Amino acid sequence: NFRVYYRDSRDPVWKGPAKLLWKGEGAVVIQDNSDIKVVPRRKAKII
Amino acid sequence: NFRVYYRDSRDPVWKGPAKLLWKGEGAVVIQDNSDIKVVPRRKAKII
Amino acid sequence: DGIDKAQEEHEKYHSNWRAMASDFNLPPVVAKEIVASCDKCQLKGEAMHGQVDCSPGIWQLDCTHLEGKVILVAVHVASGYIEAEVIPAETGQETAYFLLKLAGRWPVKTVHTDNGSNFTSTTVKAACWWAGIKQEFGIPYNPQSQGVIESMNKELKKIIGQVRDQAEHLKTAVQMAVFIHNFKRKGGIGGYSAGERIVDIIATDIQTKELQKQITKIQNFRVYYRKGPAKLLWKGEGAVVIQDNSDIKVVPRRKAKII
Amino acid sequence: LDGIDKAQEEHEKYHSNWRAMASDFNLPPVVAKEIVASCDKCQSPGIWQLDCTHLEGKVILVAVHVASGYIEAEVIPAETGQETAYFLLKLAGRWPVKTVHTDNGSNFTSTTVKAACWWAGIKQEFGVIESMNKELKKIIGQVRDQAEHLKTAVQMAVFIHNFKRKGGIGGYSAGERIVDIIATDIQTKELQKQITKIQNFRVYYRWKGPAKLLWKGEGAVVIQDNSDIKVVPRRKAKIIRD
Amino acid sequence: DGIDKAQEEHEKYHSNWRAMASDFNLPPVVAKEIVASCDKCQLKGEAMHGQVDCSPGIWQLDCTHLEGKVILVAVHVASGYIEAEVIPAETGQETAYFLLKLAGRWPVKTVHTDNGSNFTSTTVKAACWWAGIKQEFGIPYNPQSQGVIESMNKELKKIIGQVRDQAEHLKTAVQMAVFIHNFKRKGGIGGYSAGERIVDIIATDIQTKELQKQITKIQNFRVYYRGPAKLLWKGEGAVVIQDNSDIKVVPRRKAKII
Amino acid sequence: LDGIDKAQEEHEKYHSNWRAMASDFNLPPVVAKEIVASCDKCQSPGIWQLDCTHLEGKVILVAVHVASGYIEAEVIPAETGQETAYFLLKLAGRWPVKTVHTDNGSNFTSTTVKAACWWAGIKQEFGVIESMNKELKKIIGQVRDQAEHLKTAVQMAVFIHNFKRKGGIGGYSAGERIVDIIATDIQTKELQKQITKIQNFRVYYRWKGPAKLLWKGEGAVVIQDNSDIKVVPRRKAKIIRD
Amino acid sequence: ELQKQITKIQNFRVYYRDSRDPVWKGPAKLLWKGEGAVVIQDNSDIKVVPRRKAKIIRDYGKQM
Amino acid sequence: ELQKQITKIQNFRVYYRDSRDPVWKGPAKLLWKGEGAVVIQDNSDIKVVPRRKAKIIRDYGKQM
DNA sequence: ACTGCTAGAGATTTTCCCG
DNA sequence: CGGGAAAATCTCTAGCA
DNA sequence: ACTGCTAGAGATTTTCCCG
DNA sequence: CGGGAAAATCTCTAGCA
């Protein structure tokens, strides 16, 4: 798996860790506490 | 001489024309309506 | 050895891998391994920019607000051709009407808009459904997904300031600005104005579609590479393009037999 | 090059237009255009017609592109000069309108519409209109039950007519026809621009006096001299401004 | 011929030179000349970024606001070393006190701040005057002039978020953040932390000044190139000559020393 | 390289420290350091002392850098643990404090100051101090006329003392001395870090058993082998991790 | 038959981009248009570009 | 006399920039420090940098 | 499972027109 | 084959709620 | 007469350690 | 002389009121 730390929207503080459900070009679909979110890769770090 | 069209500060609409008293690196000192102003070259066009 | 001391140092100070390595003589790999285990140290994301869709059928819509008046704008991403209009109240009905006017004049196959309330209104959903348009929504509070249209807003607004003194109504000035942008500003990929560019884009789409249809109808070849009967698409100049299991692959003439 | 004599032969035997010769014979468009122009014997897209059709006491201003039947209809609250001027402004902005044909109504002659045409660079003037309008009315009646207003039904009918009604030589809807026509107009305009910018140059070959210059390529130059088209190497050709 | 038509087109549509030239077959020079004559068509300035001063003795000051509390911050431009402190009220007296504390601990020669009210307060002016500091102000509403300190206002703030759960008060968190930034984050030009970098900058300044003074005291040569000028350095066939506040690099040819 | 035997002879005759040998003999610092360490016969900057001086019924916490006389003084309202802890935190943040000397006051022993020292990584332990403090008091008395309050006078006195009172071997004010001392400490720390990084390597020269590798250059490698410092070409030396 | 159709399909300019490069590249000559992938030749480099990253035009300014 | 002092003054690293380039360049060896102009040598390139655009250090990670 | 971009301003480099 | 000046290309930035 | 910058995240390229 | 993997460098972006 992967660990993804993200900033969702207009929310300066970062969140995570979350599971990486899907990775694309320019955006990534993650699962934070069973909540599926979509975040641009400018607002995510994957480890 | 030169013609300088500038945006002064937090003022989206541009002004000018004004005379060019002095030109530097990154900022220019102009004379608009006999008022001497300093404007970053990012906020000025010289012709 | 120094791993435990550096771990305590980080737990207290949240040092970057560089400081940990230079202080406790750690290897950079271990320093970054430690720094990557601190949830409070993941305060930055990948430095890059995505790429919005540029298909011929993609249109990007957005509301802008000028002089206390709502201007609904749509842009053809592939060409930069814009259609804008002043609407009194930013509501679902007016947005659906504008979108339906747009669809009936140009071949709109998809609308990529922000998550505004009006663009999400069920009336707009029904209007898209009837006209066979596919709605797309950017990430919430991610204006970059709509960059093109957003850019146009500024551009559009700029032009208005130039011509707002030649008209009394704002709708008039908006139409003047749209006209100037579409048929009096030249640049872009083809040195065209936006209207000419969209005309060229759409005409080229139709032409290429029909040519490809005719060639496929007349031309048919089965190709073996290295292993099945792939469908030929292009051949010559040392390379051959073959479709096999929804895979467009280019292989040299060698190890590529046609029958 | 080398197909100019074939171009002349085919043109004389068949009297074809420059487009066809250039496409078939691979000639540059400019040389084909000057060939077709030479033949004295062998010797419109941006015009729309407006009409206000009344339904349910509501004015529907319909503009028809004669060359393709492309329809653009808008419900206007009242037959005032302001609304017609705004409609014309929208039309000119969205499409390259050069001339408009009207019925010389009270509103169509208003000073407001006059100024709108003047600024937008359109000139006013006073068999397809009737057929297209009747088709639009039929479609409106067909799809009037799916809309709770009249402007919505008008837009639905316009969409159906422009993009779902396929007809003509190639079974192409109105949208395809209009986009093709405007593309052809653009090609013509670019050709004319190149001709205008090149006609001011003179060429000395072999030295032989000035001759009309048609095309400059990579190693050859095609010129016109006394109705005779000649391809000359660049080395023995000198280009002069005046 | 087409110039009049192009002028009448631009007076209404404000077309760019490209469209004018393409439509009316104008030369690009003439199209740009026409477009440059329209005052309403000058809506963009030259795309570039200046360069802030990075002298050793320059400090950039700015107020940031965190959790409703004013944090006054100063940064050593040449090294990124930062001092910070929570002040109860964004007033002139507290800013002057902060600046006087800073001056007495580090060799501050000039301060470059925004045009905030507190930084313009006459108390701060007097404090700068007494401590022999030179006050510099960026162009109004041009935060890029302070791009260094502003940057720290982010970086410092970021650190404050990591260590705000280790302190009850915001002043303690601010001081912890300053400490971490100065002596626990490494990078920059020299791979140093900010504190090490400032120490190196100041020590190098003093050392270079003293060595140069001694060399000038002992070494002295008069040069003629191509009048009697001073010599500063010679090597690898090149010579550095000082003449009327002009530093020039000239080869040995047309360069003689007496 | 080169002047290594000369370095040994000079060290034996004069017992100089590695800094002087390396600077004079152009040697890398590491080899000079290993040379000086070899001689048994030939065999502090980040320690401050705090004292609370009471003037006009107001506490002034003065921290003195013993190695240079650098003074950092702050007026504090009350002799509480919180104020001293905050002062120590500011001092540690601004300067590299490793050990603090205190008079074992009640405030200095408070759990708050204990935690502040623990977090900032400082160690507490309980002739220059008195002279420095009395000099500060003299300057405060001198400049009090120019200050509206006492904190302003304290800061003016600190500035005058640190950057306007020039004295010592080289006539350097306290600021110059402290920057020099901290720079020297940084140089020492870098040398020690490099030594630790390199000490874990073995070298086989000419084959001869493992030897202590000291410096690696462009084409020469300086190693230690049984109190013997030898420069070997890069080839004849094989380096290993052990 | 196929000759002229191929010749005039390969006359369409194509502008493309890659996943990280944000600048549209020069007019690669078109070679084939697919549903979502277009095959092009940018100076004898035969590449496959996703349709969403491709602008296919018939540059009339160049064509004339 | 002058030899060792010159060597020491030339042992200092300098980082500089030009009027348009926004990124600091490599550590050019110092050659001379003036009031407002510092003369440096970046790989045998003798240049004059304004003092405000110059960071002069004595990098110890490299000195050691 | 989605995605920054557009147009203008100087700077710099080709490149056609003159030898 | 060598230059000159204009043309073409490149780099960079404001602003879009 | 003054002036965007800093630190981190992936990519990409050297370059020292193994043959 | 040729590679491998880590180190050094490079490019790019958020955000600072």
Ligand SMILES: C[C@@H]1CCO[C@H]2Cn3cc(C(=O)NCc4ccc(F)cc4F)c(=O)c(O)c3C(=O)N12
């Ligand atoms: C309530 C709707 C739905 C939810 O989102 C909000 C907020 N929003 C914000 C911007 C905005 O921030 N534009 C500036 C900008 C900044 C960066 C960039 F790359 C591009 C840019 F345009 C808009 O333009 C915009 O239309 C909206 C909007 O409509 N909404």
Ligand SMILES: C[C@@H]1CCO[C@H]2Cn3cc(C(=O)NCc4ccc(F)cc4F)c(=O)c(O)c3C(=O)N12
């Ligand atoms: C009332 C004082 C005096 C007059 O000016 C205002 C407004 N201002 C604005 C910003 C600001 O816009 N920061 C964001 C930002 C944007 C761009 C960039 F390059 C750097 C940046 F920091 C400040 O930070 C700031 O301190 C002030 C301020 O203090 N004042």
Ligand SMILES: [Mg+2]
């Ligand atoms: Mg929006």
Ligand SMILES: [Mg+2]
């Ligand atoms: Mg928007």
Ligand SMILES: [Mg+2]
């Ligand atoms: Mg401020």
Ligand SMILES: [Mg+2]
């Ligand atoms: Mg600020």
Ligand SMILES: [Zn+2]
């Ligand atoms: Zn951490």
Ligand SMILES: [Zn+2]
């Ligand atoms: Zn204009």
